[PDB]
RNA sequence: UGAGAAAAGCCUUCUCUAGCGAUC
């Protein structure tokens, strides 16, 4: 008679050393893995519940303006540089990474109605209630020199 | 000029195994917006099935076999002839523990084939790794024991004592004494739901959630004493045998049985189903062994009359069927490729020291566990165990850290009790009655003197 | 864990199934390849990583590629190269990239990567490898040369090799090796242009572009040897002899007052009637040396001339010697000659049976350097050859001049001569004076020769008297006791008590570190007829405790071999 | 955000290339591990040139 | 079994194998068994059920 | 406090850091 029985070689299935990681053979036979529909539904249900647990959208709030914020302009070249304008007439430049204000300039008298950044990123344009269109330099004034358009 | 230009083909039968679409459906669609989604769905299915076909080569083991020569019958071949002709590793798996001072033993294998636990009628409870010859625990409850089962990993085991239900650690420490489950005859665990089902003498079927520790359901069978019980691993339903000759299908959600199937002209004493959930094996007092097709037909595929009575039945992962009649066990073998086992002539035979009280196949080994009055024996059954196991589901060679990672994943993925139905894919179909209720609401918002008479 | 390994095995599957399509490999062979590939893959995806696992992975894939290459020729199937070979090569390139990223400092891994890229990879992939090499290893001039070498000899791009060389000199401005190879490379470019013209500008074809390298390199590196070296490559190229002519003329004009330039001109003139013609060339080379002497009178120039006389004599012989003897005298009066070269001539004169000039060299050496003891040994050997009866006065004059007491070869040499041609008592007197003068470790050889003389001049009784007197002078050697044991063995008595008595004294002095002495003692108890073999148990027990460190392990191995027949 | 940084050390000059980084939230508790952990730092930063003294 | 992580605890809250107070009241019972050494759990049940009968009689009276 | 208290030897379950791994 001819007889064979399953005989797993232990060296194949057990790692050689303590430094080695465990060997994990995988079989994709559907008979071994039943309930494919109900099991996956629970995982999807758990995924939605975990999404509501970790929903924390608020990051930071920037303060320093002395009237309502009216205009916003982002910088084309840098992610962390943004420009804002308040109703009192001042324009502030913010650092998003440091969450602080870099510069403050008194651009106009009254509201500032619009602000746009030149595509190169070395200047911006502001408009106020004083019937004035002003161009400024994005680089900060040197030392304590007062800023001029 | 390349003789064979095309890519490598994959077997159609192998791809069909990794397939979950109903091609028989002839639904008509006349809209391109419907058409685009459908073709993508077929495209997604075909590519996944092809990849698994190539992965068949990664399988490294082969199932065992045993065939005679010069017309000899495999039934007359004894275990001693097998042991001398098989390697030293498998020969060590055949042993005969002799414990007759205690009562007849009921045995259970863990879901991973590494661990075995057994319980005696007189109250001997012991758990051990059976591959190596070491004893995890060995205790003697003063009360009688009717059934023994494992709960998920080897850490927890449940015994059905004479009065109540008790839970023990793998080292022998008593954890729970459940007084609601009383006079329980049979125990069996649903793995993917973490529910333990109990059959009691009073006639009640109770479901207990071991993960949380609360009883989800308690059902009155209203059929008298309950002593024959089994589950369908594919279906997750519970089968109950009765003296009427009928088998009742049960789920924790319903207060009434899902179905009743009349199988015998007398009382049924054994029931067993295959792992795939296709075939059902029953035996009764009319000395008839029956095989039923559970896939919507519920007709007896095969019938055979037996000299003695088959007290117990079991199914392996490859489809072998074993019947325990008195002190003699008989195994029937069939090709199993979309076919039931052949009852024409048995495959192997063996005679025990005492009458058989429990049968089970080891999950991923070619051995059979038999519990009887004399003690516990382990047979060698070539071709019964499934060769290639999955390392992430049931790894015999898993470390403690691997085991604890798997347990959390299973606990994250526990299936609620109410989802158990006759169809494991019942969640996929659209609720048709809820469709028409919604449609109703949608519609809602959207001769001359004869005239004197 | 096994998810990445599983991804890589499923990536490896399609070429394996195509190979099964070919008929090149059988299904069991594919199974074995899959098994070994998984085994090798598991090693390199661990948290702890070693280089040898990467090396084994690369070697296994190379062996598989070679096996496929051998089998394709036998089958005759040349289709589907891209499906299999390119995939394997891409995987090996990924493995090499990961290994090189992990271990940047290992040059050998980089060179193995370069070799594999040369053998199996596209030329642009090899081009990317050199840039990665030179980016972090720019401080090694040899790596610059290898990159430039590949561009010229393989890629045939002279322009690329020029920029690699020019950039290399900016990192290493003072490397002479870089200049010489850059000088060679441009001359190689000129030959390719000469061969280009014959198949179908003038200035480079003359070798002018190499001449610009010559002038600048000389200015940066002001060395004669580097200047001569550029001429060596220049002579190697047959074309543009004028370039060799220009370099050769600048040798004497620019580089003067250094001996090497005058030597090169002498050897350049060097390169029965033929022997007369050969003899004629020698004087012309000899003649040039004197103007070198007259212009440059330094000592270092003088050795280059006397040595030149030496090989010609060792390489007619009378005429060669006549040159050597005169130039020796000329150097001797000027006293510029140093100590070492006096010996080399005199030792040379002894070997060719001419014994009179050697005496004059010996006398001149002693007069110039009286204190040198090596000269006095050198003179002594001459008169032993000459057999003149002036040996006795030589010892009197040498030791008087040698004020330092430690003259070990002289004390030895006096012993053998006194034995040969002097009475027995005077030989003993010389030995006793030697032991008084030499007190340190040099007395070890003195005592051994004293004991050997006693056995020869006298008998066993004379050796016993000398051994008893010298047994307490602690500076010893194992040869002292081994010689005395041999003398007892040769005598007919062979008193075993004396044999044991000599071994105990030797084991007292050197038993802590000498494994051979203990093993020799044990074999005496077994092999000797008067020995007691039952004592060997105690000798082995005593040997282990006194021996220290590796000597203890040596005795075990030697005894284990002695128990077997290997001894 | 691909850019090159010049780092000067006592041993020599090093030139390095940065592939990607979360710029805005860099100074935050969770994103800071990108530069602190050596394995994550190797993911986004490579050594393209080194010139020792 | 392992110490649950912060995300795991939210999904696997109220899961505890050893303590099932609502079902068997084992922790409360264990204190009674240890304080007065009771060989069998059944003896405690008879005392508890009989105690209910005494109290039920008093409330009805 | 009340499986009294105290001391030794074996298994079981689990907790912290620290390197290491993510560069193809």
Tokens in use for B276?
């795939």
The residue with tokens 């990681």 is A21
Report residue A80: phi and psi, to 5°.
-90, 5
Residue whose tokens read 């005859």? B185
* Cα radius of gyration rounded to whole Å, chain A: 32
Q: Do chains B and E touch (3 or more CB pairs under 8 A)?
A: yes
Using the CB atom, is residue E58 less than 7 Å from strand F? Answer: no
Q: Which of B8, B399, B402 would best serve as a mutation to test chain C binding (most C beta carbons within 10 A)?
A: B8
Give kind and range of the element (H or E) at residue C171. Answer: helix C158-171
- The dihedral built from the CA positions of residue B215, B221, B222 and B228, taken in this order, carries a sign that is negative
Reading the block at residue B237, the tokens are 């339903």
User: What is the side-by-side order of every strand in the sheet holding B328-332?
Assistant: B312-315, B321-325, B328-332, B348-351
Where b means 16+ CB within 10 Å and e means fewer, B51-79 reads ebbbbebbeebebbebeeeeeeebeebeb
C-beta neighbour count of D22 within 10 angstroms: 13
Rounded to whole angstroms, how far apart are CA atoms C494 and C485? 10
Q: For residues B382 and C208, give the distance between their C-alpha atoms in angstroms, rounded to a whole number.
A: 88
Q: What is the nearest CA distance from A53 to chain B, expressed in angstroms?
A: 16
Structure-token match 């460190």, residue found:
C549
C139 at the D interface (CB within 8 A)? yes
- Rounded to whole angstroms, the distance from the CA of residue B172 to the C1' of nucleotide F13 is 13
Tokens encoding D21: 């980084």
Q: How many CB atoms lie within 10 A of CB B338?
A: 6
CA distance D36 to chain C (A): 19
As given in the structure block, the two tokens for residue B114 are 């590494």
What residues of B are in contact with residue E41 (Cβ under 8 Å)?
Answer: 164, 177
- Does the distance separating the beta carbons of B62 and A4 come in below 8 Å? yes
Closest chain A residue to the Cα of B389, Cα to Cα: A27
Say whether the CB atom of E34 is under 7 angstroms from strand F.
yes
Three-point CA angle E20, E17, B409, nearest 5° = 140
Angle between helices C339-351 and C373-386 (to 10 degrees): 20
**Between the CA of C158 and the C1' of F16, what is the distance in angstroms?**
65
The answer to whether some atom of strand F lies closer than 7 Å to the beta carbon of C48 is yes
Which residues of chain A are within 8 Å of residue D25 when distances are taken between CB atoms?
59
Counting Cα atoms < 13 Å in the Cβ hemisphere of A10 gives: 4
- How many residues does the structure list for chain A? 149
Report the alpha-carbon distance of residue B231 to residue B195 in Å, rounded. Answer: 12
| C3-CA/F12-C1' distance, Å | 32
DSSP letter at E2?
P
* A93 sits in which H/E element: strand A90-95
Tokens of C428: 């003993």
DSSP letter at E5? Answer: P
Q: How far is CA C364 from CA C329, C333, C369, C370, C384, in A?
A: 10, 10, 8, 10, 18
Residue pointed to by tokens 């089962």: B149
Protein C48 CA to nucleic acid F14 C1', in Å?
Answer: 26
Question: Does nucleic acid strand F have an atom less than 7 angstroms from the CB of B98?
Answer: no
Q: Which of E4, E7, E13, E15 to mutate to test the interface with A (most CBs of A within 10 A)?
A: E7
Contacts of A among chains (3+ CB pairs under 8 A): B, C, D, E
B124, B158, B174, B231, C250 from B119: Cα distances, Å: 6, 10, 15, 21, 108
Give CA separation, C227 vs B321, C142, C145, C216, in Å: 96, 21, 21, 11
Nearest to C316 by CA among C357, C352, C351, C272: C272
Interface of B with E in 198-217 (CB under 8 A): 210-215
How determined?
Answer: cryo-EM
The Cα angle at residue A136 between residues A131 and A137, in degrees rounded to 5: 175
Which residues make Cβ contacts (< 8 Å) with residue C247, sequence separation at least 6? C214, C230, C231, C234
In three-state secondary structure terms, C472 is coil
- Starting at the edge strand found earlier in the chain, the sheet holding A100-106 runs A69-74, A81-86, A90-95, A100-106
**Angstroms from A21 CA to nearest CA on chain E:** 20
Q: CB contact, 8 Å: A53 with chain E?
A: yes
For chain B, give the secondary structure using H, E and C. Answer: CCCCCCCCCCCHHHHHHCCCCCCCCCCCCCCHHHHHHHHHHHHHHHHHHHHHHHHHHHCCCCCCEEECCCCCCCCCCCHHHHHHCCCHHHHCCCCEEECCCCCCEEEEECCCCCEEEEEECCCEEEEEECCCCEEEEEEECCCCEEEEEEECCCCEEEEEECCCEEEEECCCCEEEEECCCCCEEEEEEECCCCEEEEEECCCEEEEEECCCCEEEEEEECCCCCCCEEEECCCCCCEEEECCCCEEEEECCCCCCCCEEEECCCCCEEEEEECCCCCEEEEEECCCEEEEEECCCCCCEEEEEECCCCCCEEEECCCCCEEEEECCEEEEECCCCCCCCCCCCCCCEEEECCCCEEEEEECCCCCEEEEEECCEEEEEECCCCCCCCCCCCCCCCCCCHHHHHHHHHHHHHCCCCHHHCCCCCCCCCCCCHHHHHHHHHHHHHHCCHHHCCC
Residue nearest to nucleotide F12 (CA to C1'): B171
Contacts of A43 in chain B (CB under 8 A): 412-413
Residues of B with CB under 8 A from a CB of C: 2, 4, 8, 51, 54-55, 57-58, 60, 391
* Cα(C115)–Cα(B252) distance, integer angstroms: 70
Q: Do B8 and C18 touch (CB under 8 A)?
A: yes
Strand F contact with E35 (CB < 7 A)? yes
- As a whole number of angstroms, the distance between CA B230 and CA B207 comes to 14
**Which chain B residues 142-181 have CB under 7 A to strand F?**
155, 170-171
Q: Kindly determine whether residue B55 and residue C10, on different chains, have CB atoms separated by under 8 Å.
A: yes
Residues of D in contact with C139 (CB under 8 A): 51-52
Q: Is A66 on the interface with B (CB under 8 A)?
A: no
Contact assignment for B213 to E1 by CB distance below 8 Å: no
Closest CA to B187 of B210, B170, B169, B171: B210
Rounded Cα distance between B55 and B44, Å, is 17
Pairing state between β B195-200 and B238-241: unpaired
Nearest CA in chain A to E11: A46
Give the other-Cβ count within 10 Å of A71's Cβ.
18
Give the closest residue to B279 by CA, choosing from B263, B259, B265, B299: B299
Would you say C42 and C5 are in contact if contact means Cβ atoms under 8 Å apart?
Answer: yes
Entry resolution in angstroms? 3.6
Closest chain C residue to the Cα of B57, Cα to Cα: C31
B163 CA vs F2 C1’ separation (Å): 31
Which residue from B416, B415, B421, B414 is spatially nearest to B254, judged by alpha carbons? B421
Nucleotide nearest residue E33, measured CA to C1' = F3
Test C10 with B51 for CB contact under 8 angstroms. Answer: yes
Instruction: State residue B448 phi and psi, 5-degree precision.
Output: -65, -40
Residue A115 three-state SS:
strand
DSSP 8-state symbol, C381: H
Q: CB of residue C102 closer than 7 A to nucleic acid strand F?
A: yes
CA–CA dist B273, B314 (Å, integer): 8
3-class DSSP string for chain D: CCEEEEEECCCEEEEEEECCCCCCCCCCCCCCHHHHCHHHHHHHEEEEEEEEC
Strand F proximal residues, B:402-431, Cβ < 7 Å: 404
Task: Determine the 3-state secondary structure of A122 from DSSP.
Answer: coil
Phi, psi of B372 (to 5 degrees): -150, -175
**The tokens of C477 are what?**
């050697």
**B196 beta partners:** B189, B208
* Residue E11 to residue B412, Cβ atoms within 8 A: yes
Residues 71-100 of C with CB under 7 A from strand F: 94, 97-98
CB contact at 8 A, C60 and C36:
yes
CA neighbor of B232 nearest in space, from B191, B189, B275: B275
Buried b (16+ CB within 10 A) or exposed e, C292-322: bbeebeeeebbbebbebbbebbeeeeeebbe
Identify the H or E element spanning A101.
strand A100-106
Largest Cα–Cα distance of chain E, in whole Å?
56
**3-class DSSP state for residue C229?**
helix
Shortest CA gap E33–chain A (Å): 42
CA of E17 to C1' of F1 (A): 29
Nearest CA-CA distance, residue D28 and chain A, Å:
9
CA atoms within 13 A on the CB side of E26: 17
Give the length of chain D.
53
E13 touches strand F (CB under 7 A): no
Cα atoms in the 13 Å half-sphere on the side-chain side of C31: 9
Question: What does residue B237 show for φ and ψ, rounded to 5 degrees?
Answer: -90, 160
CB-CB neighbors (< 8 A) of A7 in chain B: 87, 89-90
Q: What is the DSSP letter of C481?
A: H
Residue B166 to residue B176: CA distance in whole angstroms: 6
DSSP C532: -
In angstroms, how far is CA B309 from the centroid of its own chain? 23
């Amino acid at each position: 008679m001819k007889v064979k029985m399953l005989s797993r070689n232990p060296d194949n299935y057990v790692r050689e050393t303590k430094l080695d990681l465990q060997r994990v053979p995988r079989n994709y036979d559907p008979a071994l893995h039943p309930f494919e529909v109900p099991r996956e539904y629970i995982r999807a249900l758990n995924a939605t519940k975990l999404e509501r647990v970790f929903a924390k959208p608020f990051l930071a709030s920037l303060d320093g303006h002395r009237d309502g914020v009216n205009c916003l302009a982002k910088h084309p070249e840098k992610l962390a540089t943004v420009l804002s304008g308040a109703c009192d007439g001042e324009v502030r430049i913010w650092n998003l990474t440091q969450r602080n204000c870099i510069r403050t300039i008194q651009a106009h008298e009254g509201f500032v109605r619009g602000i746009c950044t030149r595509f190169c990123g070395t200047s911006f344009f502001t408009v106020g209630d004083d019937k004035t269109v002003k161009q400024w330099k994005m680089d900060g004034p040197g030392y304590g020199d007062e800023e001029e358009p | 000029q390349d003789p064979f230009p095309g890519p490598a083909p994959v077997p159609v039968e192998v791809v069909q195994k990794f397939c979950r679409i109903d091609k028989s459906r002839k639904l008509p669609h006349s809209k391109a917006k419907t058409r685009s989604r459908l073709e993508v769905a077929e495209a997604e299915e075909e590519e996944t099935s092809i990849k698994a076909a190539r992965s068949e080569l990664l399988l490294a083991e082969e199932p065992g076999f045993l065939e005679g020569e010069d017309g000899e019958d495999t039934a007359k071949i004894c275990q001693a002839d097998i042991v001398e002709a098989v390697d030293i590793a498998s020969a060590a798996k055949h042993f005969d523990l002799n414990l007759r001072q205690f009562g007849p033993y009921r045995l259970n294998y863990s879901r991973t084939g590494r661990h075995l636990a057994f319980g005696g009628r007189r109250g001997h409870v012991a758990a051990l790794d059976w591959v190596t010859k070491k004893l995890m625990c060995e205790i003697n409850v003063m009360e009688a024991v009717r059934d023994i089962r494992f709960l998920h990993s080897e850490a927890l085991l449940a015994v059905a004592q004479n009065r109540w239900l008790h839970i023990y650690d793998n080292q022998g420490i008593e954890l729970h004494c459940i007084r609601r489950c009383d006079r329980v005859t049979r125990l069996e665990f649903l793995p993917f739901h973490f529910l333990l089902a109990t059959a009691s003498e009073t006639g009640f079927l109770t479901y207990l959630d071991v993960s949380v520790g609360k009883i989800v359901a308690a059902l009155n069978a209203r059929a008298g004493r309950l002593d024959v019980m089994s589950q369908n691993p594919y279906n997750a339903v519970i089968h109950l045998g009765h003296s009427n000759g009928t088998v009742s299908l049960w789920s924790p959600a319903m207060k009434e049985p899902l179905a009743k199937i009349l199988c015998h002209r007398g009382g049924v004493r054994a029931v067993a189903v295959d792992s795939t959930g296709t075939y059902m094996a029953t035996s009764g007092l009319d000395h008839q062994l029956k095989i039923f097709d559970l896939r919507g037909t519920y007709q007896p595929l095969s019938t055979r009359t037996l000299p003695h009575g088959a007290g117990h039945l079991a199914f392996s992962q490859r489809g072998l069927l074993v019947a325990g009649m008195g002190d003699v066990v008989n195994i029937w073998a069939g090709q199993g490729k979309a076919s039931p086992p052949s009852l024409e002539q048995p495959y192997l035979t063996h005679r025990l020291s005492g009458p058989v009280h429990g049968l089970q196949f080891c999950p991923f080994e070619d051995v059979l566990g038999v519990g009887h009055t004399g003690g516990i024996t382990s047979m060698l059954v070539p071709g019964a165990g499934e060769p290639n196991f999955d390392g992430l589901e049931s790894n015999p060679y898993r470390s403690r850290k691997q085991r604890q990672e798997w347990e959390v994943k299973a606990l994250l993925e526990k299936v609620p009790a109410e989802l158990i139905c006759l169809d494991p894919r019942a969640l996929a179909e659209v609720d048709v009655i809820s469709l028409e209720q919604g449609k109703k609401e949608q519609i809602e918002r959207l001769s001359a003197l004869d005239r004197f008479v | 864990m096994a998810e990445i390994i599983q991804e890589r095995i499923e990536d490896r599957l399609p070429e394996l199934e195509q190979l099964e399509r070919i008929g090149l490999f059988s299904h069991a062979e594919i199974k074995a390849i899959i098994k070994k590939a998984s085994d090798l893959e598991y090693k390199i995806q661990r948290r702890t990583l070693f280089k040898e696992d990467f090396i084994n992975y690369v070697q296994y894939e190379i062996n598989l590629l070679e096996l496929i290459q051998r089998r394709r020729t036998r089958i005759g199937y040349s289709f589907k190269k891209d499906e299999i070979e390119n995939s394997i090569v891409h995987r090996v390139q990924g493995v090499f990239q990961r290994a090189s990223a992990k271990w940047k400092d290992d040059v050998q891994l980089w060179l193995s990567y370069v070799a594999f890229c040369k053998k199996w990879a596209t030329k642009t992939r090899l081009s990317k490898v050199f840039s990665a090499m030179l980016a972090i290893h720019s401080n090694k001039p040899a790596l610059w040369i290898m990159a430039a070498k590949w561009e010229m000899e393989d890629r045939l791009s002279s322009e690329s090799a020029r920029q690699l060389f020019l950039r290399a000199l900016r990192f290493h401005p003072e490397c002479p090796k870089l200049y010489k190879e850059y000088f060679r490379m441009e001359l190689m470019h000129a030959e390719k242009l000469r061969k280009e013209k014959e198949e179908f500008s003038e200035e480079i074809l003359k070798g002018e572009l190499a001449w610009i390298i010559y002038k600048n390199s000389v200015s940066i590196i002001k060395g004669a040897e580097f200047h001569v070296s550029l001429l060596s490559i220049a002579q190697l190229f047959d074309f543009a002899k004028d370039l060799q002519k220009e370099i050769y003329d600048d040798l004497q004009a620019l580089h003067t007052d250094d001996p090497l330039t005058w030597d090169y001109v002498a050897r350049r003139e060097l390169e029965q009637a033929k022997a007369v013609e050969v003899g004629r060339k020698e004087e012309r080379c000899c003649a040039v040396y004197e103007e070198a002497v007259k212009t440059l009178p330094t000592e270092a120039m003088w050795k280059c001339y006397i040595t030149f006389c030496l090989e010609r004599f060792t390489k007619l012989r009378g005429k060669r010697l006549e040159r050597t003897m005169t130039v020796f005298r000329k150097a001797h009066e000027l006293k510029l000659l140093s100590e070492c070269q006096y010996k080399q001539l005199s030792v040379s004169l002894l070997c060719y049976n001419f014994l009179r000039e050697a005496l004059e060299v010996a006398v001149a050496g002693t007069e110039l350097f009286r204190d040198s003891g090596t000269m006095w040994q050198l003179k002594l050997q001459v008169l032993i050859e000459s057999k003149s009866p002036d040996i006795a006065m030589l010892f009197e004059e040498a030791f008087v001049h040698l004020k330092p007491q430690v003259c070990l070869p002289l004390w030895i040499s006096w012993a053998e001569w006194s034995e040969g041609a002097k009475s027995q008592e005077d030989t003993e007197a010389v030995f006793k004076k030697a032991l008084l003068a030499v007190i340190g470790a040099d007395s070890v050889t003195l005592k051994n020769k004293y004991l050997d003389w006693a056995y020869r001049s006298g008998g066993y009784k004379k050796a016993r008297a000398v051994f008893k007197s010298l047994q307490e002078s602690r500076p010893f050697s194992v040869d002292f006791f081994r010689k005395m044991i041999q003398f007892e063995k040769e005598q007919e008595s062979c008193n075993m008590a004396n044999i044991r008595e000599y071994y105990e004294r030797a084991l007292r002095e050197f038993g802590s570190a000498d494994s051979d002495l203990w093993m020799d003692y044990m074999k005496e108890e077994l092999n000797h007829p008067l020995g007691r073999p039952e004592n060997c148990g105690q000798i082995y027990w005593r040997a282990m405790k006194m021996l220290q460190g590796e000597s203890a392990e040596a005795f075990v191995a030697k005894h284990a071999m002695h128990q077997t027949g290997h001894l | 955000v691909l850019l090159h940084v010049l780092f000067e050390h006592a041993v020599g000059y090093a030139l390095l290339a940065l592939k990607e980084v979360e710029e805005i939230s860099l100074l935050q508790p969770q994103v800071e591990e990108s530069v602190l952990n050596l394995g994550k730092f190797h993911s986004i930063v490579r050594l393209v040139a080194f010139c020792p003294f | 079994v392992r110490k649950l992580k912060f995300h795991e605890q939210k999904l696997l809250k109220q899961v505890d194998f050893l303590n099932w107070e609502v079902t068997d009241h084992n922790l409360h019972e264990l204190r009674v068994l240890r304080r007065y050494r009771l060989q069998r759990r059944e003896d405690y049940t008879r005392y508890n059920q009989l105690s209910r009968a005494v109290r039920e009689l008093a409330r009805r009276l």
